[PDB]
Structures are given as C-alpha cells and as structure tokens.
C-alpha cells in the first residue's frame, strides 16, 4: 500500500514542477530601474549642457 503512494508522490511532483515552470515562464518581468537623476533647473546653465 506504499508503492501507490509513491506513484502519487511522483505525479504530484510532476504537477508541482509544472507549476514552478509556469511560475518562471508566464511572468517575464523586468524592472530596468535606470536610476538617473531627473533634469533640474540649474542643468540648462550647467557647463555640461553648454553647447
């Protein structure tokens, strides 16, 4: 009565691996912070922007 439980364990772990795969697959997130300071008032008169 234990081997049937082993088959149940293997089918449930197959299902769980499917769940983990879809968890890593469907939400293909990407933050891409690109944290650079916004242009301030003095920037137009900063020497860097002095064309």
């Amino acid at each position: 009565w234990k081997g049937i439980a082993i088959a149940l364990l293997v089918i449930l772990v197959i299902c769980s691996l499917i769940v983990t795969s879809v968890i890593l697959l469907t939400p293909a997130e990407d933050n891409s912070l690109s944290q650079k300071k916004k242009v301030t008032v003095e920037d137009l008169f900063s020497e860097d922007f002095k064309i």
């Binding site: 049937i4 088959a7 149940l8 089918i11």
Partner: protein
C-alpha cells in the same frame, strides 16, 4: 426494543456494494469510495 432491532437490521442489507467493469457509473462508484481501486485512492 423493536425499533432498536430494526435499526441494526436496516443496514444489514449492505450487499449491493459487491463484485470500470459495468458502465461509466461503475467507475463513478469506483472513485466515490476511495479504497476500491488504486486510481480512486491516488485521485482522492
């Protein structure tokens, strides 16, 4: 006393539950009781 002894007699007719062999309803009853077949228990 008689209703007591009829109470212990009504369930004495539990014989229809005896020997996926008859129809779709057969496998239905098979997984209704999760000890008849290996599929029933694993599903349960």
């Amino acid at each position: 006393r008689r209703r007591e002894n009829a109470e212990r007699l009504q369930d004495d007719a539990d014989t229809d539950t005896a020997g996926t062999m008859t129809a779709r309803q057969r496998v239905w009853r098979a997984f209704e009781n999760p000890h008849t077949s290996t599929m029933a228990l694993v599903f349960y």
